[PDB]
Amino acid sequence: XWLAYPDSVPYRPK
Amino acid sequence: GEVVLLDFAAAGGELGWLTHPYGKGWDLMQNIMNDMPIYMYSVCNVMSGDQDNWLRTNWVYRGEAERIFIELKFTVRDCNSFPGGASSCKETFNLYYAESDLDYGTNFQKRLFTKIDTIAPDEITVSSDFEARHVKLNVEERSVGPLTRKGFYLAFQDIGACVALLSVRVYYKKAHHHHHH
Numbered sequence: 001x002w003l004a005y006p007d008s009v010p011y012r013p014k
Numbered sequence: 015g016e017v018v019l020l021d022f023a024a025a026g027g028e029l030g031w032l033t034h035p036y037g038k039g040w041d042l043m044q045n046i047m048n049d050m051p052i053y054m055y056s057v058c059n060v061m062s063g064d065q066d067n068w069l070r071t072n073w074v075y076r077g078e079a080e081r082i083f084i085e086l087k088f089t090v091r092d093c094n095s096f097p098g099g100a101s102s103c104k105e106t107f108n109l110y111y112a113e114s115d116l117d118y119g120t121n122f123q124k125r126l127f128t129k130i131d132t133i134a135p136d137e138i139t140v141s142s143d144f145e146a147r148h149v150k151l152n153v154e155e156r157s158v159g160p161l162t163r164k165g166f167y168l169a170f171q172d173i174g175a176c177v178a179l180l181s182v183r184v185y186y187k188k189a190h191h192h193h194h195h
Contacts, residue, residue, distance in 0.1 A: 002096060004043075004056035005089060005178035006147050011044035011053065013028055 015191035019082065020074050020168075022182040027053040032070040032122050039067025039172060040179075047147070058176035060096050060103040065174040068124060071182070073117035073165045079186035081159030084109065084168065087181035089149045090135040096176075106134045108171040109156060113163035127169050130156050151180070 022029065033040045039059065045052040059065050086109070093103035110127040137150035170179060 002058050002060065002091070002176060004058040004091060004176050005045060005054055005180075006144055006149060007047050008043040008045045008054065008056060008178070011027055011042050013030075 015188040016083075016185040017077075017079070017188065018183065018185045019077070019079060020071060020182060020184040023053070023087075023180060027051070029072060031055065031072065032068075032120065034068040034070070034122055034124075039065070040069040040170070043178070052180065054178045054180045055170070056178040057172045058091070059172075060093070060174060060176050061099045062102070062174075065172055067172040068122070069170040069172075069179070070122050071168045073114070073167060074184065075165050076161050076163065079159075080161055081157060081186065082161065082166075083155055083157050083185050083187060084130070085153065085155045085181065085183040085185070086133060086179065087151055087153050088133070088135070089151060089178045089180070090138050091144060091176035092138040092140045093176075095141045095144070102174065104173055104175040105138060106132050106173075107175050107177050108173065109133050110169040110171060111158055111166055112169070113161060113166045115164040117165065122169075124169070124171075127167070130158055149178075 093100040109130045112127040135152040
């Protein structure tokens with residue numbers, strides 16, 4: 001794999 | 015003189031847009047390298063065969079709007095960045111919409127949607143810029159109308175690109191559209 005955007009990580013409000 | 019109906023970036027990651035299929039495709043992501051977090055919906059399933067990944071906004075109440083303007087900000091990575099395996103990478107994505115009087119909630123049926131356009135970047139981001147954290151942000155706008163139902167959805171279809179969607183701003187325009195201060 002590859003990321004679309006630098007230094008991005010999956011996010012979900014909690 | 016703009017009336018804003020939807021503004022993704024202003025919503026700080028809280029809108030919970032629908033993604034289809036379950037799991038594989040568009041994903042809500044955060045970047046925290048600047049003073050404030052940045053949110054986006056990203057997908058980058060290059061080198062993975064045929065892709066058909068959908069992202070759908072929540073229902074948007076039309077109100078008085080008859081002709082809407084849809085402003086997108088996004089990045090696209092150069093397909094030359096990825097191993098020889100654009101034989102398995104695209105540099106566009108597709109914008110769709112559907113009108114409806116009622117909100118169908120979690121029931122997303124792509125067959126109800128009409129393509130507005132293929133969205134292509136003016137500037138692709140090459141690997142050296144990506145690694146230097148200097149991505150190339152693109153802005154594209156399209157207009158749709160006349161609208162006639164109580165509301166509408168927008169949707170974004172990825173067919174195998176490496177794309178980050180950072181802004182989706184939908185507005186209608188009254189006279190005297192300018193800024194101030």
